[PDB]
Amino acid sequence: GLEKTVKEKLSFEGVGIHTGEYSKLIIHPEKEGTGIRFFKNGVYIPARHEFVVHTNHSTDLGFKGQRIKTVEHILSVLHLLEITNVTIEVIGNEIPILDGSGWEFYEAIRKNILNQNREIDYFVVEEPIIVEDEGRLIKAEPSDTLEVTYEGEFKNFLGRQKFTFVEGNEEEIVLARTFAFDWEIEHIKKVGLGKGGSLKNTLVLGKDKVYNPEGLRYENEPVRHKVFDLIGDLYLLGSPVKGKFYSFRGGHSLNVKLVKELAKKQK
Amino acid sequence: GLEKTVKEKLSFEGVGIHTGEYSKLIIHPEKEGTGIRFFKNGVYIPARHEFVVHTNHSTDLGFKGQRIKTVEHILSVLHLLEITNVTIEVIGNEIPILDGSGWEFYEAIRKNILNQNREIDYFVVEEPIIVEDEGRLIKAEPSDTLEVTYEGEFKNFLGRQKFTFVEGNEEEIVLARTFAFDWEIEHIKKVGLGKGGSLKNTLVLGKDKVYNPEGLRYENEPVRHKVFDLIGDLYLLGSPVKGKFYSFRGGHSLNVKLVKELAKKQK
Ligand SMILES: CCCCCCCOc1cccc(C(=O)O)c1
Numbered sequence A, B: 001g002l003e004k005t006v007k008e009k010l011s012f013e014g015v016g017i018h019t020g021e022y023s024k025l026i027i028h029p030e031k032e033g034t035g036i037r038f039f040k041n042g043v044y045i046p047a048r049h050e051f052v053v054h055t056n057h058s059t060d061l062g063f064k065g066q067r068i069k070t071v072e073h074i075l076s077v078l079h080l081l082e083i084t085n086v087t088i089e090v091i092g093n094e095i096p097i098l099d100g101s102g103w104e105f106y107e108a109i110r111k112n113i114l115n116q117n118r119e120i121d122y123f124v125v126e127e128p129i130i131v132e133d134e135g136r137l138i139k140a141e142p143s144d145t146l147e148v149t150y151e152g153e154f155k156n157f158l159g160r161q162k163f164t165f166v167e168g169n170e171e172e173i174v175l176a177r178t179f180a181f182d183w184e185i186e187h188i189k190k191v192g193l194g195k196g197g198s199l200k201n202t203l204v205l206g207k208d209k210v211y212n213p214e215g216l217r218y219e220n221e222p223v224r225h226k227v228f229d230l231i232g233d234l235y236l237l238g239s240p241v242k243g244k245f246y247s248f249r250g251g252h253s254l255n256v257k258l259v260k261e262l263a264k265k266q267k
């Protein structure tokens, strides 16, 4: 397809799920070939793997002393809509989490796409590749269309779940919310994170219960969310991706590791 | 002691722990013999047991179609400081929870006490009384000073703990925050409550862990808070109380039941 940008600037504000501080982003249009980049305190941070500075509990980008936490969701939405040229100005030190999914981002951006003149130069997976890490594993291989499957093995009532995204089913994942198990909340808060978390932006699961009064949007919302996360991290390759991926218990760390190795192979 | 009121209007505001709505209080000075009462939408609601309408998860009052939720903390502070004549005007449906303790209420009211021209007519427990409820038990008996002990038998790391308040040690209980076990969060939310709860106003305990990063102010903060709640519920007797109390696993429901039976015996 053609490269895209936004008809007019779009802005979102709220709290960062980790910083707990006010956060707001403004998406501005950019000419062809610009790519996706963030702007914070005078510094431009390209949405690329080389600028990753943290992958525990979120994917954070940094450059010249300026860091932006949790870019996975806004990037996932941009990847799914194939938005290729925009400048995301950031107020605060993290992207607003909103309700924990990509819904608000998706609905707003979707109705404001602007086709540009230049066919997209996709990052095409050319050969099979596999990165592993303590049971966790992610595999990628050639495909004319983006296809992402996430398989989880949970230690709670969820047990083993599996979900697969294919082009055209964007709406099956942009609603999946961020999630966390009660037994990991203590740790997250202890290490200086999750300061903005709440039942309003996070699905909290117990060994055999869902804390949120609204329950799950889908019986497999967690794995749908993981697919969403992976699509966001994959966009750090620099351009829309075309390949088939299968992630088994993967996380941001493994996702980024995969992205870096795919990049080395000069696809 | 002499009856007391505040020197001038005092105001407080914030989210209610249950309604999740923003509320505001205005404590108005009153003359001798007025008593403690709330005021909402033109209606006066005496801080007395006959007006209790709910005791699950909070003590709520109502009269003529006007309801005010969670009056136990402000009433406890007023009881401890012996404020006997004031009108608590509430713009909203619940008393602000603030940090979950009585600290802010205590600090402000304590610096604005106005002794009045009348000796307090204390509610004096005349004879021993006991109220029970499936394992839970509260005992009351004659005493020249207000003495309140609470014993908890918790199903988590807290185990069996005990705490005793005696006159003069007010500062040992006005800081103890509201608490709840993680296993009851799901329930509270599903029954339309705790809409304004968070780790900022609630101490969340697990089977053997404290979720809040700040931890506990006291190894027995929970029983201290239970003592604080009971002293608040006892003020529903209509006037400062003189008696020795022992509560084993009590809650608002059992507290109010004790108050009602004590009032019947006109003890
Ligand atoms: C891997 C992503 C982890 C995101 C952690 C979000 C923090 O969890 C919470 C849930 C509910 C309430 C609170 C609170 O502080 O009241 C915090």
Ligand SMILES: CCCCCCCOc1cccc(C(=O)O)c1
Pocket: A197, A198, A199, A200, B017, B057, B178, B179, B180, B185, B188, B193, B194, B196, B197, B198, B199, B202, B204
């Ligand atoms: C004694 C009655 C207490 C009622 C409050 C229950 C505590 O609720 C929460 C705690 C932490 C986070 C949340 C949230 O919604 O993120 C809600």
Ligand SMILES: [Cl-]
Pocket: B056, B191
């Ligand atoms: Cl209930």
Ligand SMILES: [Zn+2]
Pocket: A026, A028, A089
């Ligand atoms: Zn701007």
Ligand SMILES: [Zn+2]
Pocket: A056, A057, A187, A188, A191
């Ligand atoms: Zn961690």
Ligand SMILES: [Zn+2]
Pocket: A072, A073, A178, A225, A229
């Ligand atoms: Zn995510």
Ligand SMILES: [Zn+2]
Pocket: B056, B057, B187, B188, B191
């Ligand atoms: Zn209940």
Ligand SMILES: [Zn+2]
Pocket: B072, B073, B178, B225, B229
């Ligand atoms: Zn309380």
